[PDB]
Amino acid sequence: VKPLQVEPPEPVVAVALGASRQLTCRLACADRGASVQWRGLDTSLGAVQSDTGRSVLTVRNASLSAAGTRVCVGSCGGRTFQHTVQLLVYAFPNQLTVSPAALVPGDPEVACTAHKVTPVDPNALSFSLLVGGQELEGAQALGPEVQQEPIGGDVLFRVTERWRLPPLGTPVPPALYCQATMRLPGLELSHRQAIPVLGGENLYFQ
């Protein structure tokens, strides 16, 4: 049995930018002088070590700089125990812009832009173009464009996907949807934004 335990116990924990999270490190020790240390990968920022059986790490209003490896180290009866946990900090986009905002007959393309997002890695962040609740088959993705989006003291990103549309068939769907999805350890986040599809006379009502 291990005398050192951390709650939550998972080796990686995802925390949203601006959110809070605590890690509680407990050390069972029958002998006096037990100590618990929380630190980063090294101690260039300062390690905190206390004479205790319970030490809690709290990131508050998380910044991107909170991301990285944390280690709790316990000392009891001359032995050392450890637990390593990786904090991932992510910014799920707070806005998704679609262009054009509504489609009319003849429109060949949709663009969807996620604002203030990180990470942008395609294995974490994905875009899909839906018709009803299914992905639209044959929509040709033209590759994400990634630009920097500075917010406060952190660099987030603005990411645009574009699709060349296939024939929509008949009857024509009432709407398409852009969806941005972020997959991280233990969780999946999504944002779906409607794109109305209008009739063939709309162009003449401008």
With beta carbons less than 8 A apart as the criterion, state whether 69 and 40 touch: yes
With beta carbons less than 8 A apart as the criterion, state whether 4 and 38 touch: no
**In this structure, are strands 145-151 and 134-135 parallel, antiparallel, or unpaired?**
unpaired
Strand partners, 195: 176
Clarify whether residues 85 and 69 are in a common domain.
yes
For residue 187, give every residue at least 6 positions away whose Cβ sits within 8 Å of its Cβ, in sequence order, or none. Answer: 14
Clarify whether residues 172 and 157 are in a common domain.
yes
With beta carbons less than 8 A apart as the criterion, state whether 126 and 93 touch: no
- In degrees to the nearest 10, what's the CA dihedral of 152, 71, 37, 63? 10
* Collapsed DSSP state (helix, strand, coil) of residue 26: strand
Clarify whether residues 65 and 160 are in a common domain.
no
Residue 75 and residue 34: Cα distance in Å, rounded? 6
Exposed/middle/buried for residue 161 (C-beta within 10 Å: 0-12, 13-18, 19+):
buried
How many structural domains is the chain composed of?
Answer: 2
Which CATH number goes with the domain that contains 46?
Answer: 2.60.40.10
Token pair, residue 174, equals: 């009432």
The DSSP result for 165-197, as a single string, is PPP--SSPPSEEEEEEEEEETTEEEEEEEEEEB
Clarify whether residues 101 and 21 are in a common domain.
no
Q: Give me Rg for the CA atoms of the chain.
A: 24
Domain that includes residue 70, residue range: 1-90
164's enclosing H/E stretch is: strand 154-164
Method of elucidation: X-ray
* Collapsed DSSP state (helix, strand, coil) of residue 122: coil
Residue type at 110? V
Give which of 9, 17, 16, 23 is closest to 58, Cα–Cα. Answer: 23
Q: What distance, in Å, lies between the first and last C-alpha atoms of the chain?
A: 73
* Collapsed DSSP state (helix, strand, coil) of residue 160: strand
Clarify whether residues 47 and 110 are in a common domain.
no
153's enclosing H/E stretch is: none
Residue 150 and residue 118: Cα distance in Å, rounded? 11
Buried b (16+ CB within 10 A) or exposed e, 163-188: bebeeeeeeebeebbbbbebebeeee
Clarify whether residues 78 and 98 are in a common domain.
no
- The phi, psi pair for 158, rounded to 5°, reads -115, 120
Residue 103 and residue 195: Cα distance in Å, rounded? 7
Q: Is the peptide bond before 196 cis (omega within 30 degrees of 0)?
A: no
Residue 2 and residue 13: Cα distance in Å, rounded? 21
The DSSP result for 47-91, as a single string, is -EEEESSEEEEEE-S--GGG-EEEEEEEEETTEEEEEEEEEEEEB
With beta carbons less than 8 A apart as the criterion, state whether 134 and 169 touch: no
Buried b (16+ CB within 10 A) or exposed e, 96-135: bebeeeebeeeeeebebbbbbbbbeeeeebebbbbbeeee
Q: How many CB atoms lie within 10 A of CB 157?
A: 20
* Collapsed DSSP state (helix, strand, coil) of residue 105: coil
Exposed/middle/buried for residue 32 (C-beta within 10 Å: 0-12, 13-18, 19+):
exposed
Last residue of a domain, one of 70, 90, 110: 90
User: Is the C-alpha dihedral spanning 193, 133, 165, 122 positive or negative?
Assistant: positive
